[PDB]
Design a protein around this ligand. Structure first.
Ligand code: V5X
Ligand code: K
Ligand code: K
Ligand code: ZN
Length: 363
């Protein structure tokens, strides 16, 4: 069938404004373009999200406030702080239109999937997983992952959200905590002091959604093989227990060695195997990005992962293109782990995995 790639030049410029990750969207797309991977995909222009589409999760008070403060720069408005705007999520000029573009893009991806137009749709500029119904958080003005899941919910009865960002997918988890129609699984750094402070293995959801949230708390220094071992093992148990008919996959590259968060020690090859394992299920799959603050490494990563979606092996040499020099001084696609210790004790990992098996026996 071949994958949908959500993209337009206007979309990319829009996504380039975010101060936490400037030009990252351009770098990501330009590298994929340079390896000519767009030629093997169906390019789809994203619809901007309508108010009612956004309101499917976000309160009208939040959206209106976000739109109002969008007019010109800000950070000063009296009501901004209660809506999560301010110093993590500053309310700059245009943010609302930026938010509506990314939400729209993820919704367009989901709609493609419902319509049978692909088995895999990609929005590398999506994945803003902390935003709550009435609150910005963790650089997320809008939870486009939730919007995507609520779009998929039109066709699919069981949706699996898998979140391989460094941070807990707390916003998406909370959104679906009370329901059993969407199971969330997050692998993330969990250490008191580390944002957002949620997602211990004992967090399983609430009410009718009890045991339909899965959290895998992991410590600094994890490298490819042991990460995959954990991820494959949890996902095996999840697929057998939950039998999902669609998957939203968040792949924030802030786990990759060289990220200034300096926490995990992964390469794109190990994430790539987690991804291959998900894609072997051959379900409708909505792929999203997320964190990633070494810009060249994030483009390296997501370009690689696009390669795995297409079943391609990529030349190790980085092709000449507009951003070639950001890949200096070695100009290769491969990333090398740091010489840092892995702080994950096998006994704790095995404890976590057992707790999770135990929880999933209820599903
Ligand atoms: C208990 O944990 C919690 C819970 C709720 C919280 N609310 C807030 C505002 C915070 C403070 C906080 O930690 N704020 C942010 C959250 C990061 C959002 C990442 C989005 C993502 O990728 N999601 O998937 C924070 O970490 N801010 C920056 C910390 C930081 C780093 C940094 C962060 C982690 C490791 C090394 C450096 N470098 C900086 C340079 C300049 C200014 C700030 C920094 C907070 C913490
Ligand atoms: K995560
Ligand atoms: K749930
Ligand atoms: Zn992150």
């Amino acid at each position: 069938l071949v994958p949908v790639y959500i993209y337009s030049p206007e979309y990319v410029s829009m996504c380039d404004s975010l101060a936490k990750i400037p030009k990252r969207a351009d770098m990501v797309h330009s590298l994929i373009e340079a390896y000519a991977l767009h030629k093997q995909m169906r390019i789809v222009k994203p619809k901007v999200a309508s108010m009612e589409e956004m309101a499917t999760f976000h309160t009208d008070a939040y959206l209106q406030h976000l739109q109002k403060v969008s007019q010109e720069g800000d950070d000063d408005h009296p009501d901004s702080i209660e809506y999560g705007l301010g110093y993590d999520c500053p309310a700059t000029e245009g943010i609302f239109d930026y938010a509506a573009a990314i939400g729209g893009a993820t919704i367009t991806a989901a709609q493609c999937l419902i319509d049978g137009m692909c088995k895999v749709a990609i929005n590398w500029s999506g994945g803003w997983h902390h935003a709550k119904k009435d609150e910005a958080s963790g650089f997320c003005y809008l939870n486009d992952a939730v919007l995507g899941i609520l779009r998929l919910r039109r066709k699919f009865e069981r949706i699996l959200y898998v979140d391989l960002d460094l941070h807990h997918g707390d916003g998406v988890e909370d959104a679906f905590s009370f329901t059993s129609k969407v199971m969330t699984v997050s692998l993330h750094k969990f250490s008191p002091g580390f944002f957002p402070g949620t997602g211990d293995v004992s967090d399983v959801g609430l009410g009718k959604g009890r045991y339909y949230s899965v959290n895998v708390p992991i410590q600094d220094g994890i490298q490819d093989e042991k990460y995959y071992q954990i991820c494959e093992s949890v996902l095996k148990e999840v697929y057998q227990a939950f039998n999902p008919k669609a998957v939203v996959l968040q792949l924030g590259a802030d786990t990759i060695a060289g990220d200034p968060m300096c926490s995990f020690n992964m390469t794109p090859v190990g994430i790539g195997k987690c991804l291959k394992y998900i894609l072997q299920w051959q379900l409708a799959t909505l792929i999203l990005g997320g964190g990633g603050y070494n810009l060249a490494n994030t483009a390296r990563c997501w370009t690689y992962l696009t390669g795995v979606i297409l079943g391609k092996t990529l030349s190790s040499e980085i092709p000449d293109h507009e951003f070639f020099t950001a890949y200096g001084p070695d100009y290769v696609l491969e990333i090398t782990p740091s010489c840092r210790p892995d702080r994950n004790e096998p006994h704790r990992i095995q404890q976590i995995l057992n707790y999770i098996k135990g929880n999933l026996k209820h599903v």
